[PDB]
Structures are given as structure tokens and as C-alpha cells.
Design a protein around this nucleic acid. Structure first.
Ligand SMILES: Cc1cn([C@H]2C[C@H](O)[C@@H](COP(=O)(O)OP(=O)(O)OP(=O)(O)O)O2)c(=O)[nH]c1=O
Ligand SMILES: Cc1cn([C@H]2C[C@H](O)[C@@H](COP(=O)(O)OP(=O)(O)OP(=O)(O)O)O2)c(=O)[nH]c1=O
Ligand SMILES: [Mg+2]
Ligand SMILES: [Mg+2]
Ligand SMILES: [Mg+2]
Ligand SMILES: [Zn+2]
Lengths: 645, 242, 456
RNA sequence: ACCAGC
DNA sequence: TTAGCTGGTCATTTTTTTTTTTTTTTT
């Protein structure tokens, strides 16, 4: 087992040059350094450690470091260099599962950290937390150039090689080794009956938990689909921007003549301030002086203003009754513009040269094992029920990738699971009601018949209501779904509690398992805990934030892991079936939002093979962990991500 | 840039106040933000107020971000526009009123541009001839895209645009709004838009502002006058020998 | 500017250069240091005479400005006082290059540098001839630019002969090759270099394979001879056509423009300034169909079948006519993809002609387009004129004399106008850079009925 | 405080 | 006594022509 550290010139998007690299070994204890001219020797050392059957320890190695080596070894000296995924291990993917909760334990330490490093899994932040940090390269280089007198141009100091870079690379691999010893000094994930610094890739993976293996496979696959990208159409979103940027410049002209300006106190100094519809103070004032009473006081002196009170508002003047609808449309158009094209993290500021969007996906960002999406967020674009939704999802298509050998577009397949957490509930409470609840879910659709039984208008409203009732609501927040009062908010709770009297028994079981005493304060809550964590489906200590969200962190943390294994198995069957992953093959993953997957493939027969084998992968997931239910999915085929929603 | 949330101290919230890399905090509940003449006119001396223009249409934040402020000195109304440099310091001023009493104070250079102290990287740029059309484009684009304007008029374009060559070299596409023609800029980069009105404000005040924005993102490349190809000349050869 | 900056009155400190690649020992040996005056740190280099007295400062700031502390002499080299002899020196272009050479040679070789650069190298290398007598070999280390090649070419007259070699570099200069790790290729360029060989001195040893290459085309010309001698036209060449007034320059270049758009199929961009656009197209239509058009009244109205003769030759997008001019020609090269650019008259476009010819030469060097430029001749002071059969010399170029120093080939035409027959021209090649040979190419006749210069 | 997702 | 998990938002210096006289090969 060796511990390697790299340093190159730029990010993985545009990297062309190698600068330095340090290797430490666990059998000779040698800081074997390398130079810019020793890159062949560096690759030979890594290939020797692979060929003898060992493990290479990087940090952030799956996302950046290993494909940087595969790119540099090709485009600098013309040689193929691939590391097998069962040899490379990471110490960031291990940190995101072992220390999954830094924001709730990092206070009391901020005396150590500067303040910008609060809750960071970066390698320098663990240098500050382990009390082993000797300077920083960027600060010392900036201080050096200000001491010489030449300017500091762009914050790009990895242009030229020097000797301080090697020293801070040595300190970097020191911090990586001192992190690895603590991360392997854990006992719940690594049993203390064997030393993990001399075992092979058949002992290290399969003589420990399954959560240490599934997380590395997920990080590998999600880094690969991050490197693939998402095909994007630019002209069809510039047409949308030029369409609805000539609408908010009419909804203000038509509206400031209705709602006039006023003098507001800044001898009494006044200023001529005009009506700004994006503010929620000007609309509150102009509705206060036009004859409207809120009768809803969230704030202690101000009302609440949102889309559910701008519908139930009536005034005397019949012009303002039409003006309020234009105010709501103006707020919608403003949010649409700021998301699509004018924001700091807009869509048109993260399009590469080849017409694709690369978004970072953190596989373990939530406390319940749910992935987060950032820079930009491709799990937050407007759906097909919101206005201007289909015109925003039609640009995010897979038919915008014309093929590089025949000049033809591709086909997209999208696969969604059905009734995921609601069927995990029937898994978990099947030991109470003897499994006569997990038979009605398999007998026809669940949400449609729930809508029939509860006389909700839409299936989406029934689906919102059932999880709102299930994850511990109050008396009003499920009466608000239909708009009625707390009388209906009580009778719906009684109706869906007296049907299956096992949810309260399961909740009492969770309360008797986790909490033992909870003292009551008139403004707070003081609880003596017994077990703050919950064993998940693969032994991972899932952290619990509040004792009334215990059913939540028991259901969604067990629902995310079956999707996380399903996305791995549905390519482990496709590669073994005789296909090729990537753009130069037959299929490519594009995006993984919390439930469904979006894959793009070359022909319709390959689409049919993928949409067949997704079912077999999901059934193998359902058989591997011995669920008491029967898991099932549903797939669609199309050109873009508006039919394949 | 956004980092995380801190608990606020005025409104008492927990996830309302946000911390940033610049050092300032901002709450979203209580909305509290924490931490010639040769005479440059002070903003507080001549009673500088950030007012708006009603008959043409310019919001207050555009005048706050562009440096176009109204003075109430000596009982009259002045519209002072400031010119800045790449370091972010006040260089010169221009005073415009109803009688067009131009008072150019300070060291007015031969390459002065309005709106260059905030915008250095990008792909497109819109170059206009005045100050009202430039603020109109900043109103239509919400003050977030690189738009500059000539501070010397559309008659001396061969001096201001020619002296600024390395500044316009940093961009990929330059789109002009002069007259509805310059060759000192490099080729394959100059685009000229065609408006059905006099300028941008005539399209803004008559409902043609959509045809402003359609000529910003879908402009055409100027093909310099008279370089007519031999194919579109049949009528001028038929009438010549007849 | 004021006085020689002492290190006590300016807080002098000797440090290294991290971002450039120079340690503190090299700047300590040379005398390069940094002062703290007026807040901004100012870097400064020291100049010393032959004795060793402090005579000049060079002050540079973080924004690349120049500040000479006083009277800057011409015999002051950066690195001159430390060495007073040797067998091999290395002449660089700047001051950081000399520090780079001292760093990569462990302070062994006598290495000097220039104090002016590639702009005033002649002034600092002509007056320093008495210093270069005590040396045995000189290795020139200039930039890989156009100005560096101009400096190493124009420095061939003020240096001693038989001792100075020139080295090449793949970087801009030695500093980027020091930063990119090319420390094994600069020593082979210091130890081994190439001799001068200025433009005319070909040794007999260097003909081992050139005679075999001699014992082994481009755009051809129409009408007899010419392409047999100058081997046709190439990319980047500037062809000149000089003749007397009325000798047939426009007809010859129009025939060359017709046969490069109907046979070679290349895009040809015309520019006629002597006439309008409604006449040259009619002349091309009359020239293609073997029947003279603009000199017959009945046939101009008899054919008006005009559209057939129009789209037979203008059916494609081949030709591009024209009715400050360098932007037009740059659009004709880039925005249209033309291969041939013809300029009909240059005198209507001393200092103006030279600047215009340098600008056209830079345009033809950057783009790589076939360029034909037509000018006129002088007025002879004794003898016959150029219209009765006097051979055109290379001296008679109308305007500032430098029309031949920036061209590549010159073709002249002579015919006896007031004589026995005016329809037998003589073509004379005056200068060819590639082939070299000059003289009479061939003989053509005009054939008054048709208009084609057929050979005879 | 608001909006969007799952 | 509390539907939940995330993101994203705002701001003080040498070129052609004319015309008089002294001397030199060549056709
Ligand atoms: C809508 C919703 C879902 N969830 C959880 C449970 C859902 O199963 C999962 C994804 O939601 P959905 O995919 O929208 O719902 P579903 O999969 O049960 O139904 P179907 O696919 O047949 O249309 O996330 C919430 O926690 N809160 C919510 O508001
Ligand atoms: C060469 C040649 C031309 N001509 C004709 C062709 C033209 O119609 C006319 C004159 O030739 P042109 O080519 O027209 O003369 P030009 O315009 O190039 O001259 P410049 O620009 O210097 O003023 O003479 C003959 O008759 N016999 C010949 O041998
Ligand atoms: Mg690293
Ligand atoms: Mg689903
Ligand atoms: Mg002519
Ligand atoms: Zn607050």
C-alpha cells in the first residue's frame, strides 16, 4: 500500500503539463520524490504497485487525480495508462461516510480553523484539524512576489515549476498519511483483527463492511458520468431568454402606472421612491393602503406574502384585482430569468466548448445518504407542471448529440422507480401487521387509489399529502394541502391512522429504541440520548438530528441505498453483456437525480436492452438484501428529457 | 460568493443570515447588511441624490451601479456622469442638463469610456454612441452584461476606439449600435445590428424593445460597404450596355 | 532620475527571483537588487565601467516601466566589469537572460549582455568594437521573433568576422526554456552553433546534396517561357508588373485573372481603381467568348442570350470585384477565401509609399496570399522612351526607390508603339528571389481581333 | 423569508 | 408542540522635372 500525491498546472478540464509527484510506501518508508522529467518513472512505479497486487491511496483520486494521469500519460508521452478501480482508493470518499457530520460538531473547534474552513472535507482543512500544517503555498507565494515586487496576476501559480512546490507536495502527502491512519483507526467500519496496510485488493474490500465498497463504486461511476456531461441546446434557451426578457419589461411599465410612487423619509429629508414589484415590502404597503386585511401573522409585525395569499386577496378597486396577477407573473418571470441566464450559476455560464454541461454531484452530502448536486444544480430545473417548464426541459435533451461517425442524433431512455419510500415503509412494518399491507401496493397503483379514497384533485396532491401525513406533520400543514381547516386536518389524520394501526406501533418502537428520556422546556427541549445513530441497511451509522424526524431518517436513508446499488448494478450487467460505456461506445449516463436515471444510447435496440436490464438490476437489488416487498420500476424512451420525465 | 449560514442577531433567525468570502453578512429576514475647470465635484457637496428618469425609464439601481447622479447645486438640476479607470478611481466628470451645458471637469483623456471599471471578461459587448441607450441596455439586461459606451460622440470614433485596442482584444464578439462603422477592430469580431427606429430608446418607448434584444443575441457580421461580388451585378451590367 | 540610488537611502536587499527562476547568488554576483522607495517595490540593475565604478542604474517597476538615473552611455554593458577576456562569450538580448545563463553555467563562462535591446543594438555594438578584440568566440543568443532576426541580421556588419556564431532556441528566449525544463538543450546551443553565411557566401562543402537536388510548381502564367524560368507564382509572393503608359498592363493582368478563375477554380478578388465596375465585367465577358465586346456598337445591342454568357462564366461565386483599403483586402482574404488579390494602381493610394509597402508586405507575410501590384515607371532623362523599345532597368521605379527592396518578382513588357508593328511584346524578368535567373522570357502577339495574348 | 426539485 | 433533504437569492527628414555649361566611350 502506497500513498501518492500529484501536482499539475491546472484543473482537469484543461490540463496539459505534469509538475511533480511524491510517493510514500508502507514497506520501505521512503519519501520517493519525482521531478518534471521523471514522469515515466512515476508511471512505472504506479504500474509496479498495481502489478504486484497492491492498493494506491490518493486523496480526491476518483474525480481529479487518476483521470489527470490518464490524460497526461496520453497527451504528453503517447502511452496508455489505466488504473483498475479495485486498486485505487480515496481518503475523501472515506471521510464523507465516516465523518458525515461536521457542521454539528465543528463548533467548539472554531477558535484552529480560520472560519472559511468551517465544515470542509478538503485536504487543507484536515491539516488544520490534525494540528499538522506548515504554511500554505498560495499565501507564501503571494507574500514572496510582494516581497520581490513583481505583481500577482491571476491567482495562477502552477504555471512554472520551482522548489517550494515539491516541499508543499511533501507536506501534502504527510497530511494524507496522517488522515489515512485516523480513518483506518475506526472500529465500526474496519475490525481491529487485521492490519490494513499490507492486505491485498481481495482482502481489503471483502474483509470489511459493504458500505466501504458500494461508496467507492458509486464515487467511480458518478465521477465517470460527471466526465461524460449533459448535452445542452443553446439556441433554444437564447430564444427563451429573448422571449421572456421582453415580458418583465412590459409587466413593470404596465404596473408602475397603476401603483404610483411616493415620498419616503430618508428639515425632514424625503425621497421619491417608486414601486419595485420584486420587493415584498412595497406590495405589502400598497396592499395595506388599498383596503386589504391579512389575517395571517407569521412575523410579529408583518404579514406573510407568497403565492398562497396572493390568490386569496380581494380589494375594492377592480384595477388592483387584475394587477395582482401581473405581480405574480412578474415574480415568476424574474425567478425564471435569474435561474436560466442571468444568475451567477446560470445555465449559459457552465456550457463547455463541446456543447455540454458538467455539474458536480456529491454522492454523500446529506446526513441520510442522499446525493447533492451543485455547480449548477441539475436536480432543480422546473418540471412540466410549472409554467415555462417544458421549454426549459426540452433544451436538456440527448438528441442534441449528433454522432461523430455517422452524423445522426441519439436516443434517450429514462428509468424511474415507483413507490420507493412508501414501499420501504411496507418493508419495515411488515413484522407488525404480518405483511397484509405489502399486498395492496402490489395490487394496482397506490397513489391513484389513495386519491380516490381521499377525494384529492390531483395525483401530485395525493402524493404530497401521503408523505406529509407520514413524516410527522401538525394539525394544519396537511389541511393546508386542500386549503381547509384543522377540522379536516384532524379527520384525515384519523382516517389514515385508523386504516392500518401499525404506523404508531412502529413509531413507538423507534422511540423505545433510540430515546429514553426527554425533559420538556416551554421554549426548548432537553433530551438525554441513548443512541444518537441508526444502523442502516449496510451497517453505516446514520446520524439523527431531531427525535421527531427519526422515521424520516429511517425511511429515506434506507431508500437512497437501494437506488445507489441499483445504479451500479445496471452498468455491471451492461458492461458484462458486451457493450461499451462512454460517448465512443453505445451508452452513457447523463444525470442521476434522487430517484430516476437518464441514460443516452446510440440505437433503439440498445435502448430496449437498457430498459430491459434495469428491471433485472432492480430485482437483484431487491433479492440481495431480502426485502419483504417486491421492487419494480418503469422506463420511458424519447428524444429529450421532456417526454422522458 | 455564498459559503454558508450563520444565526442572525437582529431578527433572531438561524438560517436567514448568510456569510460570504468578502467578509460581509446578509440577512434575508430582517434585510440588514453589515460589514477648463480641473475640479472634481464631490458627491456630498453638490447635494448628490440617486433619482430616476421617468419620461425615458431608468431604475434607481442602474444609476447606483453606473455612476449617473443628479445634483441639486445652486437651485438647478445637473446630471453628472463619472468616468473611471481600471484601478477604480474617479478620472473625469460630465455635466448634462436641459440646456446641454456641457462642463467637462478633470483630465478627459482621448480614450475615455463609460462603464469600463467593472467589466473585463466575457464574450459579447454592446457599444453605443450616447449614455441613455447604454443605460437602456443595462435596464433590459439588469446590469450584469458587459456594455460600454463612447464618451466622445459618433463623429470621433477613429480616435477613442483606435486607442483602446488591448481592452477590446480580451473579448470574442463586439456588437455596435452606432447609427440606425469602424475598421480598426480585428476582423471576424465586428457585428452591426439594424433597428427599425432611431436608437434604442425609441424602441424602448414604443414597444419595440424585444427587437433590441433579438439584435443583441442574433446580430449579423458587417460586410464592409461596396465589396459587391460579381454575381449580384446583372442589372447594373444590363442597363450599362443598353 | 535624481541621483544614483544608494542601498542605505533606499533600503537595499539582495534576494532571489522565484517567479523568474534566478537564485540570490546570481543577483549577488551581478548587482541586481530591489529598493523600497515610494511604497511600491522597485527592481533595479547596476551598470559598471571598465574600472568598476558605479555609473548607471536601470529602474523597473511591477508594470514594466523604464527609469534611467541619468546620463546613459553607449559603452556600458550589463556584465562587462566582471570579465576582461576569455575564449567564449555569450551575448543575450536582455538582463534576465544573462542571469539565466550565469545560473545554468555555475558562473564559469564570461557572459555579458546588452543595455538597449533589439531596438538600438547597432549603436551599442558599433562603438564597442575595441572591447571585442580580446575575445576568441562570440555566441549570439537572441529572441525567436522578427525583431531578434532583424537584430542578428543587422549586427553582421559591426562585429568581427570569423569568430561569431549564432544559436537558436525553441522558446522566446532562454528564460522560458529554463522554466520549461529545457536545461539540456541550451548547453548544446552554447557549445555548438552555426556560422553567419550572410546572404551571398556559399561554401563549396555545403553542396553535398544541393547539386543532387539540382540534378533531380505553383500557379502558372498564360502566354508562352515565364513559368519555365521563375517556376510560377507561390503563396506569399508580391508580383510586380511595371511597364510604360499604354503598354498593356491591365490587359495582361486581366488575362491572368481570367485563366485563374475558369481553369484553376480559385477565388480571385479583383480591385480596379483605374475604371468602374460596369466595364471590367464586360471586358471579361468579351475576353472569354473570343469576341471583343466594348469596341463594337452593333454587337452590344444585337445580343440583348446575354444571361447565358453571364452565367457561363459568372455562374459560380468565383470572382469578387470592388468599387482603409487593407481592411477590405483582409476581408477578401479571410471572409471570402480568395487566393489572388490584384491591385491595379498604387500611386493614387516618400513616406506614404514606404509605409504602404511595409504594410502590404506584412499582410502578405501574415496571410499567405498571391498578391499582384501594378505601378509605373520613371521618366528617362536621355535617349528614347520606354514606348519605342527601350529595355526597362531595375532602377526606374516610380516612387521612393524602395519598390524593389520589398518585392519578390518583377515582370516588364516592352513593345515598339510608333514602329513597324505594335503587336509583338517582349517579356523581361527583372528579379526572382527563388530561381535567381533574369532576362528575356518570350514573345507574344496581341491578335487585335480577339484579345488573347497568344504566343509566337 | 421566498422559489424549484425529489 | 414542530412534513423532511438540498440549492440559489442580496450589498458600499528624402523623394520627381527644367534648364546653363565642362568633359568621355559608343553607336
Ligand atoms: C414528492 C415527495 C417524495 N419524497 C420521497 C418519497 C418518494 O418515493 C421519493 C421520490 O418521490 P416521487 O418519485 O415523486 O414519488 P413516487 O416514486 O412514490 O411515485 P411515482 O414514481 O409512481 O410517480 O422521495 C419526499 O420525501 N417528499 C416528497 O414531497
Ligand atoms: C499590349 C497591347 C495592348 N493593346 C490595346 C489593349 C488596350 O485596349 C490598349 C491599352 O492597353 P491597356 O492595358 O488598357 O493600358 P493600361 O490601362 O494598363 O495603362 P496605364 O494604367 O498605365 O494607363 O491597347 C494592343 O492593341 N496591342 C497590344 O499589344
Ligand atoms: Mg491531491
Ligand atoms: Mg418515482
Ligand atoms: Mg491600366
Ligand atoms: Zn436578521
Amino acid at each position: 500500500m502506497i500513498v501518492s500525491a500529484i501536482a499539475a498546472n491546472a484543473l482537469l478540464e484543461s490540463v496539459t503539463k505534469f509538475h511533480c509527484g511524491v510517493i510514500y510506501d508502507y514497506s520501505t518508508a521512503e519519501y520517493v520524490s519525482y521531478r518534471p522529467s521523471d514522469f515515466g518513472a512515476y508511471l512505472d512505479a504506479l504500474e509496479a504497485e498495481v502489478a504486484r497486487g497492491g492498493l494506491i491511496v490518493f486523496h480526491n483520486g476518483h474525480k481529479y487525480d487518476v483521470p489527470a494521469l490518464t490524460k497526461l500519460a496520453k497527451l504528453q508521452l503517447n502511452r496508455e495508462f489505466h488504473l483498475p478501480r479495485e486498486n485505487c482508493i480515496d481518503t475523501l470518499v472515506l471521510s464523507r461516510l465516516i465523518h458525515s457530520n461536521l457542521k454539528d460538531t465543528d463548533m467548539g473547534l472554531l477558535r484552529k480553523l480560520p472560519g472559511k474552513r468551517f465544515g470542509s472535507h478538503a485536504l487543507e482543512a484536515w491539516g488544520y484539524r490534525l494540528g499538522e500544517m506548515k504554511g500554505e503555498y498560495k499565501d507564501d507565494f503571494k507574500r514572496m512576489l510582494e516581497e520581490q515586487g513583481e505583481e500577482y496576476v491571476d491567482g495562477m501559480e502552477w504555471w512554472n515549476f520551482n522548489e517550494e512546490m515539491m516541499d508543499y507536495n511533501v507536506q501534502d502527502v504527510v497530511v494524507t498519511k496522517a488522515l489515512l491512519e485516523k480513518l483506518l483507526s475506526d472500529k465500526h467500519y474496519f475490525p481491529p483483527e487485521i492490519d490494513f496496510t499490507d492486505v491485498g485488493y481481495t482482502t481489503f474490500w471483502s474483509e470489511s463492511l459493504e458500505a466501504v465498497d458500494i461508496e467507492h463504486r458509486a464515487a467511480w461511476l458518478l465521477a465517470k458520468q460527471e466526465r461524460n456531461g449533459f448535452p445542452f441546446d443553446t439556441k433554444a434557451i437564447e430564444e427563451l431568454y429573448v422571449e421572456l426578457a421582453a415580458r418583465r419589461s412590459e409587466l413593470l411599465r404596465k404596473l408602475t402606472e397603476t401603483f404610483g410612487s411616493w415620498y419616503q423619509p430618508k428639515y425632514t429629508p424625503v425621497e421619491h421612491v417608486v414601486f419595485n414589484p420584486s420587493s415584498r415590502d412595497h406590495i405589502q404597503k400598497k396592499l395595506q393602503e388599498a383596503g386589504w386585511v391579512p389575517t395571517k401573522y407569521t412575523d410579529k409585525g408583518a404579514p406573510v406574502v407568497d403565492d398562497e395569499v396572493l390568490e386569496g386577496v380581494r380589494v375594492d378597486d377592480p384595477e388592483k384585482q387584475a394587477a395582482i396577477d401581473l405581480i405574480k407573473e412578474y415574480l415568476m418571470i424574474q425567478k425564471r430569468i435569474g435561474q436560466s441566464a442571468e444568475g451567477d450559476k446560470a445555465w449559459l455560464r457552465y456550457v463547455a466548448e463541446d456543447g455540454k454541461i458538467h455539474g458536480s454531484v456529491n454522492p454523500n452530502g446529506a446526513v441520510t445518504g442522499r446525493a447533492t448536486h451543485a455547480f449548477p444544480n441539475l436536480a432543480q430545473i422546473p418540471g412540466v407542471r410549472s409554467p415555462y417548464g417544458e421549454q426549459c426541459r426540452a433544451a436538456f435533451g440527448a438528441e442534441h448529440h449528433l454522432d461523430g461517425i455517422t452524423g445522426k442524433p441519439w436516443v434517450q431512455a429514462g428509468i424511474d422507480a415507483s413507490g420507493l419510500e412508501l414501499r420501504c415503509l411496507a418493508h419495515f412494518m411488515a413484522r407488525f401487521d404480518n405483511g397484509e399491507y405489502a399486498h395492496e401496493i402490489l395490487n394496482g397503483d397506490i397513489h391513484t387509489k389513495n386519491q380516490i379514497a381521499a377525494e384529492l384533485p390531483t395525483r401530485d396532491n395525493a402524493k404530497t399529502f401521503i408523505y406529509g401525513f407520514l413524516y410527522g406533520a401538525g394539525d394544519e400543514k396537511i389541511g393546508q394541502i386542500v386549503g381547509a381547516g384543522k377540522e379536516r386536518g384532524k379527520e384525515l389524520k384519523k382516517k389514515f391512522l385508523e386504516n392500518t394501526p401499525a404506523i404508531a406501533a412502529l413509531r413507538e418502537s423507534i422511540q423505545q429504541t433510540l430515546v429514553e428520556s426527554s425533559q420538556w422546556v416551554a421554549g426548548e427541549q432537553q433530551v438525554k440520548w441513548k443512541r444518537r445513530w441508526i444502523k442502516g441497511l449496510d451497517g453505516r451509522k446514520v446520524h439523527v438530528r431531531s427525535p421527531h424526524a427519526a422515521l424520516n431518517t429511517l425511511l429515506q436513508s434506507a431508500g437512497a441505498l437501494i437506488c445507489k446499488l441499483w445504479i451500479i448494478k445496471t452498468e455491471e450487467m451492461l458492461v458484462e453483456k458486451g457493450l461499451k460505456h462512454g460517448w465512443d461506445g453505445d451508452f452513457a449516463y447523463m444525470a442521476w437525480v434522487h430517484d430516476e436515471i437518464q441514460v443516452g444510447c446510440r440505437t433503439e435496440e440498445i435502448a430496449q436492452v437498457v430498459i430491459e436490464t434495469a428491471q433485472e438490476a432492480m430485482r437483484w437489488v431487491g433479492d440481495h438484501w431480502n426485502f419483504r416487498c417486491l421492487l419494480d420500476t418503469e422506463g420511458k424512451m424519447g428524444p429529450n428529457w421532456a417526454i422522458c420525465h | 460568493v455564498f459559503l454558508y449560514h450563520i444565526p442572525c442577531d437582529n431578527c433572531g433567525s438561524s438560517d436567514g443570515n448568510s456569510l460570504f468570502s468578502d467578509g460581509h453578512t446578509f440577512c434575508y429576514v430582517c434585510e440588514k447588511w453589515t460589514a477648463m475647470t480641473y475640479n472634481v465635484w464631490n458627491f456630498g457637496e453638490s447635494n448628490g441624490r440617486y433619482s430616476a428618469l421617468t419620461a425615458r425609464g431608468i431604475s434607481k439601481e442602474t444609476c447606483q451601479k453606473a455612476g449617473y447622479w443628479i445634483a441639486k447645486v445652486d437651485g438647478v438640476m445637473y446630471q453628472v456622469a463619472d468616468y473611471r479607470d481600471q484601478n477604480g478611481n474617479i478620472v473625469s466628470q460630465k455635466v448634462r442638463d436641459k440646456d446641454k451645458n456641457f462642463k467637462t471637469t478633470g483630465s478627459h483623456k482621448s480614450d475615455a469610456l463609460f462603464g469600463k471599471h467593472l467589466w473585463n471578461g466575457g464574450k459579447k459587448i454592446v457599444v453605443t454612441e450616447g449614455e441613455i441607450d447604454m443605460l437602456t441596455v443595462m435596464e433590459l439586461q439588469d446590469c450584469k452584461y458587459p456594455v460600454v459606451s463612447l464618451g466622445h460622440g459618433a463623429s470621433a470614433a477613429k480616435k477613442t476606439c483606435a486607442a483602446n485596442y488591448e481592452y477590446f482584444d480580451q473579448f470574442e464578439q463586439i456588437i455596435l449600435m452606432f447609427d440606425m462603422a469602424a475598421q480598426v477592430l480585428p476582423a471576424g469580431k465586428v457585428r452591426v445590428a439594424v433597428l427599425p427606429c432611431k436608437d434604442a430608446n425609441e424602441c424602448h418607448l414604443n414597444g419595440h424593445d424585444r427587437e433590441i434584444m433579438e439584435q443583441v443575441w442574433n446580430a449579423g457580421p458587417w460586410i464592409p460597404d461596396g465589396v459587391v461580388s460579381a454575381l449580384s451585378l446583372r442589372e447594373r451590367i444590363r442597363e450599362h450596355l443598353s | 532620475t535624481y541621483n544614483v540610488w544608494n542601498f542605505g537611502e533606499s533600503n537595499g536587499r539582495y534576494s532571489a527571483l522565484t517567479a523568474r527562476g534566478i537564485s540570490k547568488e546570481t543577483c549577488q554576483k551581478a548587482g541586481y537588487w530591489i529598493a523600497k522607495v515610494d511604497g511600491v517595490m522597485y527592481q533595479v540593475a547596476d551598470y559598471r565601467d571598465q574600472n568598476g565604478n558605479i555609473v548607471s542604474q536601470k529602474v523597473r517597476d511591477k508594470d514594466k516601466n523604464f527609469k534611467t538615473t541619468g546620463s546613459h552611455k553607449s559603452d556600458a554593458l550589463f556584465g562587462k566589469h566582471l570579465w576582461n577576456g576569455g575564449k567564449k562569450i555569450v551575448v543575450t538580448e536582455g538582463e534576465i537572460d544573462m542571469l539565466t545563463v550565469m545560473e545554468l553555467q555555475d558562473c564559469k563562462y564570461p557572459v555579458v549582455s546588452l543595455g538597449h535591446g533589439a531596438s538600438a543594438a547597432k549603436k551599442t555594438c558599433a562603438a564597442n568594437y575595441e572591447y571585442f578584440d580580446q575575445f576568441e568566440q562570440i555566441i549570439l543568443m537572441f529572441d525567436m521573433d522578427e525583431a531578434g532576426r532583424k537584430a542578428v541580421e543587422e549586427a553582421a556588419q559591426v562585429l568581427p568576422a570569423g569568430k561569431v556564431r549564432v544559436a537558436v532556441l525553441p522558446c522566446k528566449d532562454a528564460n522560458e526554456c529554463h522554466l520549461n525544463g529545457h536545461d539540456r538543450e541550451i548547453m548544446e546551443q552554447v557549445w555548438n552553433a552555426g556560422p553567419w553565411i550572410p546572404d551571398g557566401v556559399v561554401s563549396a562543402l555545403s553542396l553535398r546534396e544541393r547539386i543532387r537536388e539540382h540534378l533531380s510548381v505553383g500557379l502558372l502564367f498564360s502566354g508562352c517561357g515565364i513559368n519555365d524560368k521563375t517556376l510560377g507564382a507561390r503563396g506569399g509572393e508580391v508580383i510586380m508588373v511595371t511597364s510604360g503608359s499604354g503598354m498593356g498592363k491591365s490587359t495582361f493582368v486581366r488575362q491572368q485573372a481570367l485563366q485563374w478563375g475558369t481553369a484553376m477554380g480559385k477565388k480571385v478578388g479583383l480591385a480596379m481603381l483605374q475604371e468602374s465596375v460596369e466595364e471590367t465585367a464586360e471586358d471579361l465577358i468579351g475576353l472569354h467568348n473570343r469576341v471583343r465586346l466594348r469596341q463594337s456598337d452593333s454587337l452590344k445591342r444585337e445580343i440583348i442570350k446575354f444571361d447565358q454568357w453571364f452565367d457561363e462564366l459568372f455562374g459560380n461565386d468565383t470572382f469578387h470585384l470592388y468599387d482603409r483599403l487593407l481592411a477590405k483586402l483582409a476581408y477578401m482574404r479571410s471572409g471570402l477565401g480568395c487566393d489572388v488579390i490584384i491591385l491595379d494602381h498604387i500611386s493614387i493610394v516618400r513616406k506614404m509609399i514606404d509605409n504602404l509597402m511595409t504594410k502590404l508586405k506584412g499582410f502578405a507575410k501574415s496571410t499567405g496570399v498571391v498578391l499582384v501590384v501594378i505601378c509605373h515607371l520613371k521618366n528617362p532623362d536621355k535617349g528614347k522612351a520606354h514606348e519605342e523599345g527601350r529595355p526597362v532597368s531595375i532602377t526606374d521605379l516610380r516612387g521612393s526607390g524602395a519598390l524593389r527592396q520589398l518585392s519578390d518578382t518583377i515582370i516588364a513588357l516592352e513593345r515598339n508603339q510608333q514602329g513597324d508593328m505594335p503587336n509583338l511584346v517582349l517579356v523581361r524578368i527583372l528579379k526572382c528571389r527563388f530561381t535567381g535567373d533574369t532576362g528575356i522570357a518570350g514573345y507574344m502577339e496581341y491578335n487585335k481581333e480577339t484579345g488573347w495574348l497568344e504566343p509566337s
